[PDB]
Design a protein around this ligand. Structure first.
Ligand code: HEA
Ligand code: HEA
Ligand SMILES: CCCCC/C=C/C/C=C/C/C=C/C/C=C\CCCC(=O)O[C@H](COC(=O)CCCCCCCCCCCCCCCCC)COP(=O)(O)OCCN
Ligand SMILES: CCCCCC/C=C\CCCCCCCCCC(=O)O[C@H](COC(=O)CCCCCCCCCCCCCCC)COP(=O)(O)OC[C@@H](O)CO
Ligand SMILES: CCCCCCCCCCO[C@@H]1O[C@H](CO)[C@@H](O[C@H]2O[C@H](CO)[C@@H](O)[C@H](O)[C@@H]2O)[C@@H](O)[C@H]1O
Ligand code: CUA
Ligand SMILES: [Cu+2]
Ligand SMILES: [Mg+2]
Ligand code: NA
Ligand SMILES: [Zn+2]
Lengths: 144, 259, 46, 84, 58, 98, 49, 79, 514, 227, 73, 43, 105
């Protein structure tokens, strides 16, 4: 039952799928009725009751395979919380845009862009695949 | 109580004073190079010397006087020293690389030849040959010294080690004088640069090694070494061979082949 | 000899979690603040 | 190589002392002779202000910033030539 | 010279609880105090120097 | 040509150095310089593990050339077995310094 | 006996997701960030010379 | 006469990315030739190919510095 | 008492702890620097000033992340804490010298900060190439302070390498051969060898820069017949080995972490892993000029450096596959450390592969000095080295401290970091292929989108770094004391308890020769 | 030039750059395949409750995972090296042009026949003409004849720079005291942009390169007009 | 009251591995085929088709009239 | 790994404090600098 | 290595050692579950009987749990095994984990 720091050098108990029979019993000290139960265990197990069998199991082991291998709802907390902090990051970005960044260059104004785009087309920027390739020079429009 | 053979060292201030003295020397150099002042530097050099002195004193206390240097400890010190020497070889390696790089592809600024136009190298058959015979001989006397110490011979140890130191000192004086006499300087392009920096760090190592030998000499005077336990001496001797071998590479490359 | 065990093999106290919070804050905070204040220092010279 | 001598029955103190005084020191004495003979000041070459030499990208941190550390007046010209 | 190593072994093996760097006696303490004073002093002074160099002198 | 005046380890070695040296001469290894030799490691012939306390870490290289070493505390009392190969070890507590 | 995740999992996931989507959509579209998307299919080229 | 030059041709002596020596060499060759011809009583025009090649390859500032140095007596190459 | 213990230490665990503290603090500095980078690049135009201030920031970022965070944490911290425990040694061979290796770091760092405070800082790139780094283009004390900072870090690491090599060769149980030492230990030994051989060459190179700047030498100055390219060879002769130094102990910790959380007693193909680390260590000394494909080098040299660089893929591949083989058939524990490790395996592979792209000098002509290089190295450093450090930190924190982290919080932390670093660096591949140069404070308008998204990702990372501090505070605040650790039979470092006593292995382990 | 949201290389302008695009597609395929396989096997290892935790034999599967990657490397190195030697092939250029790096601009020298040289500076953002590109335009472009083999010689008069034009697959470092050679051949007329590619101080970001490719006849008359 | 059949009880992990490594291999070839069609061949045919009837003078002339060149009006 | 229950439990509220104070110690000083950047850039 | 039948026989014999002790019981099971297989009914039969000789009911039940676990997603295996073990389970009075409620989380 109760494990202590200064027992680290002693054989200990674990619940592990791949180490089914640990080095010590889950419970080492036995009450009077528990002692009587260990005695009865020396006779035919058919005479043991279901409750007695469960009790013998629970003396030897802490959790069953089913208990130890159970899944949990941790993922919800984890994913939820990560989304929360990513969301919080957006607030930092908002603060930064508002108070730190000035206006961007004039070359991003809509009219500048429209003129630059024509010029890029007149110069046939990336004419094979990247940019001008996507412009229909015959119909004077973006390729549908 | 331990039942292994290694040395648990007493908590020590020397690592800290060592590190701080590094900060004072590097700061100091900065201060000297840029703010025309030598004071930080002088302080750094002082604490550096005081650190080295006490630290190695303590090593002597721990070994000769306290007995912590079991064979397993001694074996560790051997690897330590070998590893240290390897690291020094690689340091020198960089300077040789620089030398071979400049001199094998002399650029148009130099006249496109080696030695560069306007450089008149020292004659390698003069003082540099003398320097070579000095270090080589010292390699011999130090081996005599080692053997005498293993054979339990106090007097001849002291004689051979003295001779070895005198030779070290000789090389140093000859080199000081060459430096003074040399018609080229550290500022005479890559010729002066590689020459003085490589032979300069070498000279520094000769001074360190001589000093280490002198420490050995005094420890021997004080009977510290036994005929079988004397690592400090071996270490100094390995270091000393290292110094000698770097010289032979300097001689072949820079004085002879680079002339 | 020295104190051993959880919370004793370390150069800082973990006796009080609030004092600890303050220390960690100063420690990691001074690290993080430094470059901003160095940037500021450069900007305000020339 | 094998040098030209012999011993090898046992390399001890006696042998290394033999080499110290029989070979090493005599070589140092010979080279010392050779050196303190081929010495004598050779005549300093005409000064030519070559741009690959007498480099000054920053003053030296001693003296007047323009003399190398082991400046020898006799043989090391300044960037503007030999000294008086 | 005579071999006085045994006296030094007795001194440094004295069970007085002193760390090796202080075990020689009162001079160890003085030399330690000089060293540490020069180092701590010098370090404060290097911090002062950085402070000074950190600002333009036009 | 020759004389003396250099102390020997016998005369001058001290502290732990001296202890290792004297121990070695009596064929003993109180400071664990040597690798102990395995017994057959059965229940009847267990590996004898000296100790100055009541437990000691054993590392068992189960088969020659295994790269994996199996580590466990060996306690005073009944022989324990290596959890990987079952070879037996028994603690033999105390002494070293008389 | 139900742990932190059994009691709060669903809420932390729901309100975490909602918050993150809301504030990223807001930052992406409402505060004047220039993403500089491709002109292709969006910009009408205009005379520049 | 044997000319009609576009640019310095491939030269198997300097086949790599670093062309510094190609400039230098052709610079020396031109000025060597020029000195040979100006001395022994002959014509500079036979030096012309080296002049074209170095002019094509060498940065103006290099040529310019080299020429200043030849005037000054500080040119480190042999002419 | 306090001074004797923390300023005068000769204890390998205390000195490990000092290194981790130092390392964590450096990480905060390195993180701030990297936010400044990404703030400047987060929208087109000028935020801070011209390229000088900008590159002062870039340079300090790299120096701090490499010499003050990664190396101190992996080698100083994990190395000192774990190596003696994993071989049952009572300490390091040179316990006092070990302390000096630590105390050299604060002064080193102080020198780096000084150089950024005097004059206009060292805006040179962490490579510190002349002539930009020389005394005319970078007049005054900043570059000299940088050089001296590197000298101190260098001495720190050379002495540390000597200490680790000696400890690992000389202080194992007599019956334990080299082929019975854990992979972490191997990884640290091989690292130490590379340090011992490569740092002195850098030392030589930067000394030469120091003398060109202050003593009128001309190693790198064409005027005096020197060569700027000689500097590059000296620096990279160190610099490639350096990156293997930064990843090897990571590889070491990955092997333990993966083995542990797979519930295996041993890594798959131990000898193959030893072989692979050795081969990588050796090959990393003969490939340095792949940093120089654009400097004007002969075609055959370029052919050789391309081919020798590529071969590194083979041993590295054996490692990657062996990690997967270790997972195979495991009883997988999905701990936070395991997540770091699994991320490590994938993202390191990606970065390694983009390194293989760069090995081809043909294509490197176009990629060199672009963001494609930046994306390659941040995959292997910001996701590689850092993931291994995080994995190691969470896995061993309970051994170092005696306390447990909150696992949920740690998984949250992993998740945020993972999104952060990917958002930061993945788009930089596009920026590189399309030609955005390195070390720019501003870029032509076309590159705006990927730079925006990259800076956003860097803010997410910032969030993860903040959360990390809170997580460590929470562990120390709550004081959940470790009880039982599984698999001690194959993880010696855990067997003396958490934390272990000040003195461990005063009585050495017993190992039979048989 | 690069265009907004670009994912890959700028379109090839020279036969060499086309060659690098095909070689990069080939390598990228291999990069996707291997990293996607790794990710796949990770997930495979991780998605079963079946276990096998006893000692696994290694000397058999290590063959496969050494030989396969070795084969893959050779399949990269072959086309890698073919391209590398192509780029080195003797070509006989019609024209030699030098460029010198400076803080912070480029100068060009065309000194085959006449003494032509000029400085090339970034157009300041405040002075862009409508439709011009921020940080990319220069006052004086490097006019060159299209469809001809040109030898570019690169150097610097101060710190390192590096001369790059991504569309033509070019990048040559500019090192003082050194004269680096590359060759340039555009398949098409037009304007081809690049940027200084070695950190060179305060304005490293602001010393771009603009090539103007036109027919020989227009190049000749430009040269003449530029003396 | 029917018994159950003895199922396969050995090598379950190995068998799963073999099955899926073989599957990974098949997907790899399918992606290699796809990629050498939607990327590699697509690229070669784009360049081939572009240059097949490309007229560089005509291209120049269009550029010139649009006004883009310093050296040609 | 198994562990004892916290010796000094840190409740949700206490965590919210530690987390706030942590984030604040990173955000406030940087925020201050960045916010006053313009004041620095021309003064 | 060896054939399937030799392996199983080797394990049957291991567990059938009349005077098998507690340590060998554990070592046997803990080693056996490392392999890529679900132990054959005959091997489990032998292990269970060893549990009986060692008066250890709880380990018998834990053995049945480990069989289930080793089958992973192959849900057919465990009930086949139990079916084959039924005479043994009746003879020794071993209740299954399911009969004991130990299969519920
Ligand atoms: C931890 C740090 C680290 C590591 C481990 C590496 C590892 C590698 N690096 Fe690099 N690198 C850096 C950090 C690192 N790098 C940094 C910081 C720079 C920039 C320096 C500067 O300029 O500032 C840089 C720059 C750099 C360049 C220069 C690019 C340029 O500047 O133009 C090159 C070119 O060859 C290169 C290549 C490689 C290669 C081939 C590897 C290999 O070691 C990777 C091998 C791994 C794999 C290949 C993946 C695993 C293998 C498999 C899954 C098997 C199958 C694979 C194949 C069949 C290919 N790196
Ligand atoms: C390990 C080295 C390392 C790391 C981790 C990083 C991390 C990051 N780097 Fe860095 N970077 C370099 C090394 C590194 N970098 C180098 C060498 C260069 C080239 C410099 C040059 O050109 O000269 C460079 C260049 C570089 C540039 C290009 C500059 C330019 O060309 O103009 C950019 C821009 O986006 C960038 C950004 C970032 C970002 C956002 C992170 C973020 O991912 C960081 C998020 C924070 C962390 C990942 C780390 C925290 C870890 C700890 C705090 C320890 C925790 C404590 C314990 C566990 C106890 N970096
Ligand atoms: C007699 C032979 C013994 C040599 C030692 C001599 C004493 C001086 C002290 C310095 C020792 C340091 C060694 C190497 C340093 C660099 C150059 C020294 C070599 C030297 O001594 O060269 C002298 C130049 O001195 C100069 O500038 C020197 C100016 C002195 C400033 C020292 C510079 C300090 C540089 C610090 C570098 C330290 C970094 C190393 C890191 C190690 C790894 C961390 C040559 O004189 P000259 O007048 O040019 O020519 C002679 C003309 N008649
Ligand atoms: C003007 C002069 C100043 C110049 C600056 C440098 C100054 C000089 C440094 C000279 C080095 C002195 C070293 C003295 C060390 C004495 C301590 C010692 O030697 O300690 C010995 C151990 O070796 C050990 O630690 C081995 C210790 C090895 C030290 C190695 C020395 C190299 C230092 C190099 C530092 C410079 C860096 C180079 C710059 C590029 C003690 O063991 P034993 O000898 O077996 O004794 C025990 C027996 O008695 C038992 O019977
Ligand atoms: C790169 C990492 C950094 C990420 C971004 C930082 C996240 C934001 C943290 C907020 O920091 C504060 O924000 C303020 C405003 O929101 C400040 O008030 C300033 O501005 C005010 C409001 O307009 C005044 O009330 C005050 O005087 C004050 O100076 C300022 O001092 C600062 O401490
Ligand atoms: Cu010029 Cu960067
Ligand atoms: Cu590299
Ligand atoms: Mg470059
Ligand atoms: Na910007
Ligand atoms: Zn065993």
């Amino acid at each position: 039952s109760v494990v202590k720091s200064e027992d680290y050098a002693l054989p200990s108990y674990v619940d592990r799928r791949d180490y089914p029979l640990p080095d010590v019993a889950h419970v080492k000290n036995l009450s009077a009725s528990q002692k009587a139960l260990k005695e009865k265990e020396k006779a035919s197990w058919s005479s043991l009751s279901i409750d007695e069998k469960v009790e013998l199991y629970r003396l030897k082991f802490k959790e069953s395979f089913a208990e130890m291998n159970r899944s949990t709802n941790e993922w919800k907390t984890v994913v939820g919380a990560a989304m929360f902090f990513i969301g919080f990051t957006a607030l930092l970005l908002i603060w930064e845009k508002h108070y730190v960044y000035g206006p961007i260059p004039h070359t991003f104004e809509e009219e500048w862009v429209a003129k630059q785009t024509k010029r890029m087309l007149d110069m046939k920027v990336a004419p094979i695949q990247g940019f001008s390739a996507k412009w229909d020079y015959d119909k004077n429009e973006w390729k549908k | 109580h331990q039942t292994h053979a290694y040395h648990m060292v007493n908590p020590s201030p020397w690592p800290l004073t060592g590190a701080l003295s590094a900060l004072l020397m590097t700061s100091g150099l900065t201060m000297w190079f840029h703010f025309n002042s030598m004071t930080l530097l002088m302080i750094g050099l002082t604490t550096n010397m005081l650190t080295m002195y006490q630290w190695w004193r303590d090593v002597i206390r721990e070994s000769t006087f306290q007995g912590h240097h079991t064979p397993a400890v001694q074996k560790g010190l051997r690897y330590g020293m070998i590893l240290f020497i390897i690291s020094e070889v690689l340091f020198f390696t960089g300077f040789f690389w620089a030398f071979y790089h400049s001199s094998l592809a002399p650029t148009p600024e130099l006249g496109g030849c080696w030695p560069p136009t306007g450089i008149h190298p020292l004659n390698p058959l003069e003082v540099p040959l003398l320097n070579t015979s000095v270090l080589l001989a010292s390699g011999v006397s130090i081996t005599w010294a080692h053997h005498s110490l293993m054979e339990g011979d106090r007097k001849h140890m002291l004689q051979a080690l003295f001779i070895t130191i005198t030779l070290g000192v000789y090389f140093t004086l000859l080199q000081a004088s060459e430096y003074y006499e040399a018609p080229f300087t550290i500022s005479d392009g890559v010729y002066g640069s590689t020459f003085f920096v490589a032979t300069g760090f070498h000279g520094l190592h000769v001074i360190i090694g001589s000093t280490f030998l002198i420490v050995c000499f005094f420890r021997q005077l004080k009977f510290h070494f036994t005929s079988n336990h004397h690592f400090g001496f071996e270490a100094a001797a390995w270091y000393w061979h290292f110094v000698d071998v770097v010289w032979l590479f300097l001689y072949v490359s820079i004085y002879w082949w680079g002339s | 000899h020295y104190e051993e065990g959880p919370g004793k093999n370390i150069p800082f106290s973990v006796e009080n979690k609030w004092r600890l919070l303050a220390m960690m804050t100063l420690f990691f905070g001074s690290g993080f603040a430094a470059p901003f204040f160095i940037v500021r220092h450069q900007l305000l010279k020339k | 190589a094998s040098a030209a001598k012999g011993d090898h029955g046992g390399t001890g103190a006696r042998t290394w002392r033999f080499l110290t005084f029989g070979l090493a020191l005599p070589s140092v004495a010979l080279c010392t002779l050779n050196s303190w003979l081929h010495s004598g000041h050779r005549e300093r070459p005409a000064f030519i202000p070559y741009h690959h030499l007498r480099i000054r990208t920053k003053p030296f941190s001693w003296g007047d910033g323009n003399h190398t550390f082991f400046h020898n007046p006799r043989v090391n010209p300044l960037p503007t030539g030999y000294e008086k | 010279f005579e071999n006085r190593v045994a006296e030094k072994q007795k001194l440094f093996q004295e069970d007085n609880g002193l760390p090796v760097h202080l075990k020689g006696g009162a001079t160890d303490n003085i030399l330690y105090r000089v060293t540490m004073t020069l180092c701590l002093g010098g370090t404060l002074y290097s911090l002062y120097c950085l402070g000074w160099a950190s600002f333009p002198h036009k | 040509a020759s004389g003396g005046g250099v102390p020997t380890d016998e005369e001058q070695a001290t502290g732990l150095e001296r202890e290792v040296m004297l121990a070695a001469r009596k064929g003993q290894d109180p400071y664990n310089i040597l690798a102990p030799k395995a017994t057959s490691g059965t229940k009847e012939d267990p590996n004898l593990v000296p100790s100055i306390t009541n437990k000691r870490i054993v590392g068992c290289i189960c088969e020659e050339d295994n790269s994996t070493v199996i580590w466990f505390w060996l306690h005073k009392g009944e022989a324990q077995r290596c959890p990987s190969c079952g070879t037996h070890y028994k603690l033999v507590p105390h002494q070293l310094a008389h | 006996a139900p742990d932190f995740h059994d009691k709060y999992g669903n809420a932390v996931l729901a309100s975490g997701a909602t918050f993150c989507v809301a504030v990223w959509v807001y930052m992406a579209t409402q505060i004047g960030i220039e993403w500089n998307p491709s002109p292709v299919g969006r910009v009408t080229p205009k005379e520049w010379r | 006469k044997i000319k009609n030059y576009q640019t310095a041709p491939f030269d198997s002596r300097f086949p790599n990315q670093n062309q510094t020596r190609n400039c230098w060499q052709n610079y020396l060759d031109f000025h060597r030739c020029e000195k040979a011809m100006t001395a022994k009583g002959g014509d500079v025009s036979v030096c012309e190919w080296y002049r074209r090649v170095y002019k094509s390859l060498c940065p103006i500032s290099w040529v310019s510095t080299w020429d200043d140095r030849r005037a000054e007596g500080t040119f480190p190459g042999k002419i | 008492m306090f001074i004797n213990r923390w300023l005068f230490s000769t204890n390998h665990k205390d000195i490990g702890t000092l290194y981790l503290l130092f390392g964590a603090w450096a990480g905060m500095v390195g993180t701030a620097l990297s936010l400044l980078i990404r703030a400047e690049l987060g929208q087109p135009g000028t935020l801070l000033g011209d390229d000088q201030i900008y590159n002062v920031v870039v340079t300090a970022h790299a120096f701090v992340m490499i010499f003050f965070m990664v190396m101190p944490i992996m080698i100083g911290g994990f190395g000192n804490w774990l190596v003696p425990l994993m071989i049952g040694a009572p300490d390091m061979a040179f316990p006092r010298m070990n302390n000096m290796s630590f105390w050299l770091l604060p002064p080193s760092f102080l020198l780096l900060l000084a150089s950024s405070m005097v004059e206009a800082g060292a805006g040179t790139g962490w490579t510190v190439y002349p002539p930009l780094a020389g005394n005319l283009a970078h007049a005054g004390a900043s570059v000299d302070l940088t050089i001296f900072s590197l000298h101190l870090a260098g001495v720190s690491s050379i002495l540390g390498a000597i200490n680790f090599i000696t400890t690992i060769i000389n202080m194992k149980p007599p019956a334990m051969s080299q082929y019975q030492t854990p992979l972490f230990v191997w990884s640290v030994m091989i690292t130490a060898v590379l340090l011992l051989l490569s740092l002195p060459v850098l030392a030589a190179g930067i000394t030469m820069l120091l003398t060109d700047r202050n003593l009128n030498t001309t190693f790198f100055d064409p005027a005096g017949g020197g060569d700027p390219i000689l500097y590059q060879h000296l620096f990279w002769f160190f610099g490639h080995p350096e990156v293997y130094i930064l990843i090897l102990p990571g590889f070491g910790m990955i092997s333990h972490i993966v083995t542990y959380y797979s519930g295996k007693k041993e890594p798959f193909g131990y000898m193959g892993m030893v072989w692979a680390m050795m081969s990588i260590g050796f090959l990393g000394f003969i490939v340095w000029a792949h940093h120089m494909f654009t400097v004007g080098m002969d075609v055959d040299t370029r052919a050789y450096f391309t081919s020798a660089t590529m071969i590194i893929a083979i041993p590295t591949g054996v490692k990657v596959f062996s990690w997967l083989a270790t997972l195979h058939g495991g009883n997988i524990k999905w701990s936070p450390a395991m997540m770091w490790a699994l991320g490590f395996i994938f993202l390191f592979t990606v970065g390694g592969l983009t390194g293989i792209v760069l090995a081809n000098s043909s294509l490197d002509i176009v990629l060199h000095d672009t963001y494609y290089v930046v994306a390659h190295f941040h995959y292997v450093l910001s996701m590689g080295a850092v993931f291994a450090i995080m994995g190691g930190f969470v896995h061993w924190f309970p051994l170092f401290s005696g306390y447990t982290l909150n696992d949920t919080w740690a998984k949250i932390h992993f998740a945020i970091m993972f999104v952060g670093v990917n958002m930061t660096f993945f788009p930089q591949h596009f920026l590189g292929l399309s030609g955005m140069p390195r070390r720019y404070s501003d870029y032509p308008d076309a590159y705006t989108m990927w730079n925006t998204i990259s800076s956003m990702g860097s803010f997410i990372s910032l969030t993860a770094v903040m959360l990390m501090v809170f997580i460590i505070w929470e562990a120390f605040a709550s004081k959940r004391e470790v009880l039982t650790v599984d698999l001690t039979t194959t993880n010696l470092e855990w067997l003396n308890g958490c934390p272990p006593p000040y003195h461990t292995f005063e009585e050495p382990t017993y190992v039979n020769l048989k | 030039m690069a265009y907004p949201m670009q994912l890959g290389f700028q379109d090839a302008t020279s036969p060499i750059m086309e060659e690098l695009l095909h070689f990069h597609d080939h390598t990228l395929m291999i990069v996707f395949l291997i990293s996607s396989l790794v990710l796949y096997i990770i997930s495979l290892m991780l998605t079963t409750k079946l276990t096998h935790t006893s000692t696994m034999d290694a000397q058999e599967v290590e063959t496969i995972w050494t030989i396969l990657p070795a084969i893959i490397l050779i399949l990269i190195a072959l086309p890698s090296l073919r391209i590398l030697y192509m780029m080195d092939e003797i070509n006989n250029p019609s024209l030699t042009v030098k460029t010198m790096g400076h803080q912070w601009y480029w100068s060009y020298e065309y000194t085959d026949y006449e003494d032509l040289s000029f400085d090339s500076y970034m157009i300041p953002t405040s002075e862009l003409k409508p439709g011009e590109l921020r940080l990319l335009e220069v006052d004086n472009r490097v006019v060159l004849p299209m469809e001809m083999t040109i030898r570019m010689l690169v150097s610097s008069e101060d710190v390192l720079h590096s001369w790059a034009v991504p569309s033509l697959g070019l990048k040559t470092d500019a090192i003082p005291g050194r004269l680096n050679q590359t060759t340039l051949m555009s398949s098409r007329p037009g304007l081809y942009y690049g940027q200084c590619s070695e950190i060179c101080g305060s304005n490293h970001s602001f010393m771009p390169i603009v090539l103007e490719l036109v027919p020989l006849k227009y190049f000749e008359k430009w040269s003449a007009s530029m003396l | 009251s029917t018994a159950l059949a003895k199922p396969q009880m050995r090598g379950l992990l190995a068998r799963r591995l073999r099955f899926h490594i073989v599957g990974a291999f098949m997907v790899s070839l399918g992606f290699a085929t796809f990629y050498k069609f939607a990327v590699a061949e697509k690229r070669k045919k784009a360049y081939a088709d572009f240059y097949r009837n490309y007229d560089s003078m005509k291209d120049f002339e269009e550029m010139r009239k649009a006004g883009i060149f310093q050296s040609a009006k | 790994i198994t562990a004892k229950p916290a010796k000094t439990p840190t409740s949700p509220k206490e965590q919210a404090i530690g987390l706030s104070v942590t984030f604040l110690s990173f955000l406030l000083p940087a925020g201050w600098v960045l916010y006053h950047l313009d004041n620095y850039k021309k003064s | 290595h060896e054939t399937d039948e030799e392996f199983d026989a080797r394990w049957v014999t291991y567990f059938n050692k009349p005077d098998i002790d507690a340590w060998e019981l554990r070592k046997g099971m803990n080693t056996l579950v490392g392999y890529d297989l679900v132990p054959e009914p005959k091997i489990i039969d032998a292990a269970l009987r060893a549990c009986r000789r060692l008066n250890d009911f709880a380990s018998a039940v834990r053995i049945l749990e480990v069989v289930k676990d080793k089958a992973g997603p192959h849900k057919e295996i465990y009930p086949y095994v139990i079916q084959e073990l039924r005479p043994t389970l009746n003879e020794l009075g071993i209740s299954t984990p399911e009969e004991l409620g130990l299969d519920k989380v």
